[PDB]
Design a protein around this ligand. Structure first.
Ligand SMILES: C[C@@H](C(=O)N1CCOCC1)N1CC[C@H](NS(=O)(=O)c2ccc(-c3ccc(Cl)s3)s2)C1=O
Ligand SMILES: [Ca+2]
Lengths: 52, 234
């Protein structure tokens, strides 16, 4: 259930509140409109291998 | 690193190298942000004065991405102790900010509860460094990485001739010939989750390198998240 079922469909951090999944992201990412995906705010975000 | 493979172009961008007065690496570090490096407290005794090099993969050629940075403040955990290597963690503030580019980027700091239930329960983590290529060998001139399995905490305590505190965890192999080694100390242990890499450990100690019935011992970063946060503000 919730966060124990495939990380709650979250890209990164998953937390359970009032029997409901709440997703969040590392510093330098913003949560997308769908409330699940994490979008980098700028160049060279944390945790990504570099390509240019 | 004993075994494993070379970090290819762009694959280990959070790697830092602590270098002595002779420009020789004696320990590793992890890039956390433009001003901060995570390392092991025990490393802060292996040189009177040192600098931090980033963006390097081959210590014998100039690739164009390398940068040396001076240290402004050394923040060592006050509860650190040489008797057991308990609380083996330090944070370094640099004099000038790191400019991110190809081969130079930070690793993500995770949240404690999520990291413990979801990252540290994954099958493996990744360790990296320029340290020895075998227990009695020389240091590597090439940056290497190696996938290391998380090891059951009970099995680890049974295998060890030295105390494994609540601030440590074990990773690696029972008999397979693959491990971190001397010189890799202070370096990154990271865990991949949906193509994003989070800091999960700091290379700390072992009874030699890749010995049978022995594992690599790492500082448990998740126990130090509030401490790290505090250090990066003051
Ligand atoms: C058991 C330990 C030791 O002397 N301790 C640990 C507990 O605190 C007191 C002293 N020890 C024995 C010799 C060894 N030194 S060493 O071979 O230069 C060495 C440094 C780092 C090593 C690592 C192997 C795997 C990981 Cl992870 S890192 S292998 C080492 O660290
Ligand atoms: Ca180089």
């Amino acid at each position: 259930k919730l966060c124990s079922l495939d990380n709650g469909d979250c890209d990164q951090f998953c937390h359970e509140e009032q029997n409901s999944v709440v997703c969040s992201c590392a510093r330098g990412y913003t949560l997308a409109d769908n409330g699940k995906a994490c979008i980098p705010t700028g160049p060279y975000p944390c945790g990504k291998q570099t390509l240019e | 690193i004993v075994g494993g493979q070379e970090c290819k172009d762009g694959e280990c961008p959070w790697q830092a190298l602590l270098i002595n007065e002779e420009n020789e690496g004696f320990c590793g570090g992890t890039i956390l942000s433009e001003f901060y490096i995570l390392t092991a407290a025990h490393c802060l005794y292996q040189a009177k004065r040192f600098k931090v090099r980033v963006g390097d993969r081959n210590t014998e050629q100039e690739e164009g991405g390398e940068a040396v940075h001076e240290v402004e403040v050394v923040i060592k955990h006050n509860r650190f102790t040489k008797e057991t290597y308990d609380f083996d963690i330090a944070v370094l503030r640099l004099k000038t900010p790191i400019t991110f580019r190809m081969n130079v980027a930070p690793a993500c700091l995770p949240e404690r509860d999520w990291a413990e239930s979801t990252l540290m329960t994954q099958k493996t983590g990744i360790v990296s460094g320029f340290g020895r290529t075998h227990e009695k060998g020389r240091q590597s001139t090439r940056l290497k990485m190696l996938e290391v399995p998380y090891v059951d905490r009970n099995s680890c305590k049974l295998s060890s001739s030295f105390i494994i505190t609540q601030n440590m965890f074990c990773a690696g192999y029972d008999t397979k010939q693959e491990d971190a080694c001397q010189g890799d100390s202070g370096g990154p242990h990271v865990t991949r989750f949906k193509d994003t890499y989070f800091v999960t450990g700091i290379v700390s100690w072992g009874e030699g390198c890749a010995r049978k019935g022995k594992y690599g011992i790492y500082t448990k970063v998740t126990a130090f998240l509030k401490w790290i946060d505090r250090s990066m503000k003051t």
